[PDB]
Structure 1
Amino acid sequence: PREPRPNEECLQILGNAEKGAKFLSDAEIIQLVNAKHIPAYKLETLMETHERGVSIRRQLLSKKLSEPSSLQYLPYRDYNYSLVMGACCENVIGYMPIPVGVAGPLCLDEKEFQVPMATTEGCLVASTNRGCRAIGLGGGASSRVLADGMTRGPVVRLPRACDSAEVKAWLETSEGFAVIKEAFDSTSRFARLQKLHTSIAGRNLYIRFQSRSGDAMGMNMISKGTEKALSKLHEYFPEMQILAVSGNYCTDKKPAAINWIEGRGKSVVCEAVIPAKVVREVLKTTTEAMIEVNINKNLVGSAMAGSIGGYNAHAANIVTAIYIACGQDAAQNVGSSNCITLMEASGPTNEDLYISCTMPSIEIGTVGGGTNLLPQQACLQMLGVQGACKDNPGENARQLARIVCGTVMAGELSLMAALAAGH
């Protein structure tokens, strides 16, 4: 065996360029960390490899648990931590595997997709698959991006509500907007300020900056632009106080009517027509029953529950699964699952099922954040939308938004059919 060497030593070895770590033992590193000679947060750099750093962190953590063996089945080895450090997570102690299933082919805008879904919910993928099959037999779905821009809603404060009114008026003129647009756009090549939306509350002024952001989701870029624009605004109104760069007016990761009404990120609509025969044989129901259930659940039931933007069956399921599979920020599902599902009779006999899904606030990107990790990049690649689209910036993010809407629609179709048919 062996025993730890004193603390005063073991820094000699740590320092030595040749005789570095890989000569110390785990217990020795533990001792050095417990003595404050190393900061634990740095263990992945000050250590021969990154995996060993997370190992050390795990051992330290285990010592403080009531059940020391808790981490046994949390996997941490043979994972590329270099892409996570300083980018994606801190105090890393391993990774959480989420099973990934595949729904498809989804026939959307004359193409076919195979949609990865990371879920632990049994039967979700199978239900989505049945919906995909129904749509495919129906002659495919169609989608359109209606609007596109990520937003940031800072709140600033003036000495008096009259001053706030003055600032609002100045922002509404062409000259003031031009100045703010120039300041905002100077911060990046994709920063192209669109029309501003202001709201006063007493001496608080809430300003909603909106802009396209290439293929990135846009939060960092929009925030940077917002900060620069607010500095410029401060130049004209030195009494202005920037209270918060986010005033919950964006609105980011909270339910808000503003996202529903004005949009946030990408606004999409998708539609399909399902023949009567296909509704009978694949969905095991009828068009009339589907419409009845749609009206009395997604419209009237949501209305009685007091829903804003929740006029759908389970869009959040599909959205969350895809988001986790493709490296999106999963909290954003809060806003991104806003959807209204409509079903009607169609065809020369009113026997076919027309269905449409409308999702005004799909917050999504294919560059930056979680999309920088290879496993998530794989799921993006199987869709054909990985990374930046050099020719037509933002095209990959738009395509991913369309696929999200189409998959949500297939899921709606399937779950609605199941509810209408009974058990």
Structure 2
Amino acid sequence: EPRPNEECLQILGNAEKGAKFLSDAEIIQLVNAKHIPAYKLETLIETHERGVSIRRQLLSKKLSEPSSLQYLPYRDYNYSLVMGACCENVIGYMPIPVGVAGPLCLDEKEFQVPMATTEGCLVASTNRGCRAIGLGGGASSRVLADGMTRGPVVRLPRACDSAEVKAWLETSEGFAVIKEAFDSTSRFARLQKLHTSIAGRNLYIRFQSRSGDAMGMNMISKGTEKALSKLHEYFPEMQILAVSGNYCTDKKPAAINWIEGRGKSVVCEAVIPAKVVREVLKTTTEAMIEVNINKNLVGSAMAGSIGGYNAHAANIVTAIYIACGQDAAQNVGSSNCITLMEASGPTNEDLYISCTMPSIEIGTVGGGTNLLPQQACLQMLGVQGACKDNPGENARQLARIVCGTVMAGELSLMAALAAGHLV
């Protein structure tokens, strides 16, 4: 049944045959003979799943363990939305367990929050925090700001010249010309106040803008390119060294995100009755405040933390992000959180808690939210896709849910640390 290389090549070149007639072992025979490269297996094979099966068989003979791919699943998966959009060189998928904590009573609504994780007790802990919040009358949240950023670096011949460009961008007329260029690229491109910083002849420009319900990194990048092109017309000696000069700052810890915000800035709060702190959280209000000051404030201060004044916001942010099709790498900046706790009520025995997260980078359209399983989790929360009547409302709601769930996670872990229940 296996044919030689030359007979198999004329069949593939045929416009009304292709690889359909050729067998599995026959296409792999063309790869080793080097007549067709490795990267020419996408647009030549008809179905996506068969292309995944061929990539896996070529891969298995390179690995030190032959049956390593055995328990990595690939069949019955919709690769149509993944190929040429979300992933390349695809050899299957990685199933991550999804649990549910809730109901989370947030802004007079009830949410069943999906959480994708492999850390034991995390879902159960977050659920216990939701239970305390619910018996305490619920939580309230506000989105304080909204605006994804990109922070290019440009170079002038001299620092005197870069100072000229900074001054020009600070005039109402200069900013207006740059804003028109930025806003011409997309419907949600709406440039907010510029933030500029000089380092000699370098100039770092932080462009900021809302992006509807998208996280908006591609949107902001397009607007930034157009704006810098317009800036070059007025200043032809300027060199665009990089569209990202790490001033954004994206996927790295940076004080600029902590202080200025990036994406959605959010605050959440709740009051937990003394009775609920006892019976649900197994501790006291006095014990909670004590651990919060000396762990989340003083402890993080001693550790030299910028933006890490919390117990484990990163656990909840990451779990929600993976379940809801977000960029999980943006957990770096999105986990920025300060958790504060005071005594409250008439007898000063109730627990006031608040979480403030100035840089939640989030979206309900684009990226991993285009995949159906991810959209199922977004649909649980009622935030799937773009909100037609109120652009950005679904992304803002998801950010509020993240902050609220983070607060629930902070309550439960801090109670366990305070009481010494570490089993």
Check whether the contact 1:153–1:248 (CA below 8 A) recurs between aligned residues. yes
Check whether the contact 2:266–2:399 (CA below 8 A) recurs between aligned residues. yes
Q: Structure 2 residue aligned with 1:398, among 388, 396, 399?
A: 396
Deviations 1:195-242 (A, max 9, x none): 000000000000000000010000000000000000000000100011
SS in 1 for 2:66: coil
Measured in 1, the distance between the counterparts of 2:198 and 2:273 equals: 50
* Aligned residue in 1 for 2:72: 74
Deviation at 1:347, TM superposition (A): 0.2
SS in 2 for 1:102: strand
Measured in 1, the distance between the counterparts of 2:318 and 2:169 equals: 37
Check whether the contact 1:45–1:53 (CA below 8 A) recurs between aligned residues. no
Measured in 1, the distance between the counterparts of 2:221 and 2:16 equals: 44
Measured in 1, the distance between the counterparts of 2:107 and 2:225 equals: 39
Measured in 2, the distance between the counterparts of 1:100 and 1:46 equals: 36
Name which of structure 1's ranges 63-72 and 149-158 shifts more when overlaid on structure 2: 63-72
Check whether the contact 1:43–1:54 (CA below 8 A) recurs between aligned residues. no
TM score, norm. by length of structure 2 = 0.98
Deviation at 1:17, TM superposition (A): 4.2
* Aligned residue in 2 for 1:310: 308
Name which of structure 1's ranges 28-37 and 93-102 shifts more when overlaid on structure 2: 28-37
Measured in 1, the distance between the counterparts of 2:146 and 2:45 equals: 45
Measured in 1, the distance between the counterparts of 2:282 and 2:414 equals: 11
Measured in 2, the distance between the counterparts of 1:398 and 1:221 equals: 17
Measured in 1, the distance between the counterparts of 2:160 and 2:16 equals: 69
Measured in 2, the distance between the counterparts of 1:407 and 1:66 equals: 43
Check whether the contact 1:337–1:362 (CA below 8 A) recurs between aligned residues. yes
Check whether the contact 1:257–1:308 (CA below 8 A) recurs between aligned residues. yes
Check whether the contact 1:318–1:407 (CA below 8 A) recurs between aligned residues. yes
Structure 1: stretches of 5+ with no match in the other structure: none
Deviation at 1:26, TM superposition (A): 1.1
Compared with structure 1, are the counterparts of its residues 39 and 373 closer, same or farther at alpha carbon in structure 2 (3 Å cutoff)? farther
Q: Structure 1 residue aligned with 2:413, among 412, 415, 419?
A: 415
Deviations 1:130-155 (A, max 9, x none): 00000000000000000000000000
Deviation at 1:5, TM superposition (A): 1.0
Compared with structure 1, are the counterparts of its residues 331 and 302 closer, same or farther at alpha carbon in structure 2 (3 Å cutoff)? same
Measured in 2, the distance between the counterparts of 1:315 and 1:17 equals: 55
SS in 2 for 1:85: coil
Deviations 1:372-407 (A, max 9, x none): 000101111111000000011000000000000000
Deviation at 1:18, TM superposition (A): 4.3
Measured in 1, the distance between the counterparts of 2:99 and 2:132 equals: 19
Compared with structure 1, are the counterparts of its residues 42 and 380 closer, same or farther at alpha carbon in structure 2 (3 Å cutoff)? farther
Check whether the contact 2:154–2:204 (CA below 8 A) recurs between aligned residues. yes
TM score, norm. by length of structure 1 = 0.98
SS in 2 for 1:266: strand
Deviation at 1:13, TM superposition (A): 2.0
Deviation at 1:38, TM superposition (A): 3.1
SS in 2 for 1:132: helix
* Aligned residue in 2 for 1:55: 53
Measured in 2, the distance between the counterparts of 1:19 and 1:300 equals: 70
Deviation at 1:40, TM superposition (A): 3.0
Structure 2: stretches of 5+ with no match in the other structure: none
Q: Structure 2 residue aligned with 1:24, among 19, 22, 32?
A: 22
SS in 1 for 2:6: coil
**1:267-278 alignment, distance < 5 Å:** 267-278=265-276
SS in 2 for 1:21: helix
Computed over aligned residues only, the root mean square deviation of the Cα atoms, in angstroms, reads 0.9
Compared with structure 1, are the counterparts of its residues 343 and 165 closer, same or farther at alpha carbon in structure 2 (3 Å cutoff)? same
Check whether the contact 1:51–1:81 (CA below 8 A) recurs between aligned residues. yes
Check whether the contact 2:213–2:386 (CA below 8 A) recurs between aligned residues. yes
Measured in 1, the distance between the counterparts of 2:130 and 2:395 equals: 21
Deviation at 1:49, TM superposition (A): 1.4
SS in 2 for 1:10: helix
Measured in 1, the distance between the counterparts of 2:381 and 2:404 equals: 13
SS in 2 for 1:9: helix
SS in 1 for 2:257: helix
Measured in 2, the distance between the counterparts of 1:77 and 1:226 equals: 41
Measured in 2, the distance between the counterparts of 1:143 and 1:348 equals: 23
* Aligned residue in 1 for 2:369: 371
Check whether the contact 2:313–2:409 (CA below 8 A) recurs between aligned residues. yes
SS in 2 for 1:42: coil
Deviation at 1:24, TM superposition (A): 1.4
Measured in 2, the distance between the counterparts of 1:253 and 1:17 equals: 45
Deviation at 1:76, TM superposition (A): 0.5
Compared with structure 1, are the counterparts of its residues 19 and 232 closer, same or farther at alpha carbon in structure 2 (3 Å cutoff)? closer
Name which of structure 1's ranges 42-51 and 132-141 shifts more when overlaid on structure 2: 42-51
Deviation at 1:16, TM superposition (A): 3.1
Check whether the contact 2:129–2:408 (CA below 8 A) recurs between aligned residues. yes
Deviation at 1:25, TM superposition (A): 1.3
Deviations 1:24-46 (A, max 9, x none): 11111001122333343342432
Check whether the contact 1:44–1:54 (CA below 8 A) recurs between aligned residues. no
SS in 1 for 2:407: helix
Check whether the contact 2:148–2:215 (CA below 8 A) recurs between aligned residues. yes
Name which of structure 1's ranges 42-51 and 212-221 shifts more when overlaid on structure 2: 42-51
Check whether the contact 1:266–1:398 (CA below 8 A) recurs between aligned residues. yes
Measured in 1, the distance between the counterparts of 2:3 and 2:136 equals: 73
Compared with structure 1, are the counterparts of its residues 19 and 152 closer, same or farther at alpha carbon in structure 2 (3 Å cutoff)? closer
The alignment of Structure 1 onto Structure 2 pairs a total of residues equal to: 421
Measured in 2, the distance between the counterparts of 1:239 and 1:330 equals: 39
Deviation at 1:245, TM superposition (A): 0.4
Compared with structure 1, are the counterparts of its residues 349 and 202 closer, same or farther at alpha carbon in structure 2 (3 Å cutoff)? same
Check whether the contact 1:41–1:90 (CA below 8 A) recurs between aligned residues. no
Deviation at 1:333, TM superposition (A): 0.3
Deviations 1:150-186 (A, max 9, x none): 0000000000000011100000010000000001000
Measured in 2, the distance between the counterparts of 1:386 and 1:378 equals: 8
Deviation at 1:68, TM superposition (A): 1.2
Check whether the contact 1:196–1:208 (CA below 8 A) recurs between aligned residues. yes
Check whether the contact 1:190–1:213 (CA below 8 A) recurs between aligned residues. yes
Check whether the contact 2:18–2:44 (CA below 8 A) recurs between aligned residues. no
Check whether the contact 1:268–1:402 (CA below 8 A) recurs between aligned residues. yes
